[PDB]
Symmetry: C3
Subunit: 152 residues, 3 copies
């Protein structure tokens, strides 16, 4: 009760210090390759890789390829693409069933920002998705190299 | 009961303090410098002043603004490490011959190289810091290392 | 009463902090870091001679990569492979030729020498590099290798 009192007051000061310090470091971490939106964080590796390699990199790091689920998330992701001036791969593919794009979990899309006419499975071999500097999406061959951006 | 939960909380906080301390060192390696309560971090690339300024602002910070010999030395470490002169936040764009911080406040510290600022060519309103730590006013259109402070 | 509620509220903040921190740790490690046990390896992304690399890590509050187990070596190997550049380890045999030690002076507790190593080629190889295949080779300290520090 009494001793417990001080202990609680001491913890409050320690917690406040951690909160202030962490707040500062979050900003530091995101500069210049990250974007925070809601409770999601997008971070680019800064280089390009084919889809399979990009996917593995994100998976191994405990995240997954960028998967914008709203206009807000897509705009945040667009900021990184614009900054690096390099279109990036999204996590979604229609490799299982042509014409039906899904997230790595198999769930159907809850948001999309396809450029006019897309997806068009050009050449009959486009099962991956890239996001342009203007934020629009286009289905593209998974063998192509695009900016690696993961979400955590 | 409450005494058992408090010890559990104490343990969680001690763990966080240890984990956070380790994480701070990791984050700052190799592009950051901690001095006092300020943190300097370089983006690792060069940009013209206006662009560099926007990058820092959008990140929730601002261009490096050394306010003491100690901060200037910390900033100097990053410049030396990348071997690339960097832009500071200060400019005399509003009133030629009078440098101020983004807020409009006058300088509280300066480390100008001999003869500077000299508004060379009548068009130097930005400031760069060299690997030796000294400052020189330069054209804002030139590209220099982007270093922000948080 | 008020104390208990004050403690439960404090724990709510602490667990929220734990969650935020966990997310930011993963973000931090991507793509230049690797965590293994309580150790963290992080590459600077560039190459430097041994003395300079050692100074960079020391000044950052850590030390050059010092894998002490197969698990740590495999973790470090991931970074070397990602950068496709052999990296320097912290150990040297500068004090006593043929006897590699950590910066502390302690003898190795783990090694993963490539066949035929360490050979002290030219009679002047007192530093250690780790290849993309995870094997070690003694190399001249003047050579430039990927900088990887451990924290
Ligand atoms: O192959 P390319 O003609 O250079 O470029 C193609 C066009 O931009 C097309 O509109 C788009 O739908 C394809 O995905 C792209 O591959
Ligand atoms: O134009 P430059 O002669 O190559 O270099 C100039 C000189 O170093 C001058 O002393 C300095 O005050 C100017 O800011 C620089 O631009
Ligand atoms: Ca298909
Ligand atoms: Ca398709
Ligand atoms: Ca297409
Ligand atoms: Ca002027
Ligand atoms: Ca001027
Ligand atoms: Ca000048
Ligand atoms: Ca970081
Ligand atoms: Ca020797
Ligand atoms: Ca030797
Ligand atoms: Ca050898």
């Amino acid at each position: 009760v009494a001793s417990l009192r001080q202990q609680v007051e001491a913890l409050q000061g320690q917690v406040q210090h951690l909160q202030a310090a962490f707040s500062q470091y979050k900003k530091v971490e995101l500069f210049p390759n990250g974007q925070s939106v809601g409770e999601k964080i997008f971070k680019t590796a800064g280089f390009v890789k084919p889809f399979t390699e990009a996917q593995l990199l994100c998976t191994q790091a405990g995240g997954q390829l960028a998967s914008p689920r709203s206009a807000a998330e897509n705009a945040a992701l667009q900021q990184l693409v614009v900054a690096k001036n390099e279109a990036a791969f999204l996590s979604m593919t229609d490799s299982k069933t042509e014409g039906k794009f899904t997230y790595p979990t198999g769930e159907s899309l809850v948001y999309s920002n396809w450029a006019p006419g897309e997806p068009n499975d050009d050449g009959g071999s486009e099962d991956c998705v890239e996001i342009f500097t203007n934020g629009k999406w286009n289905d593209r061959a998974c063998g192509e190299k695009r900016l690696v951006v993961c979400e955590f």
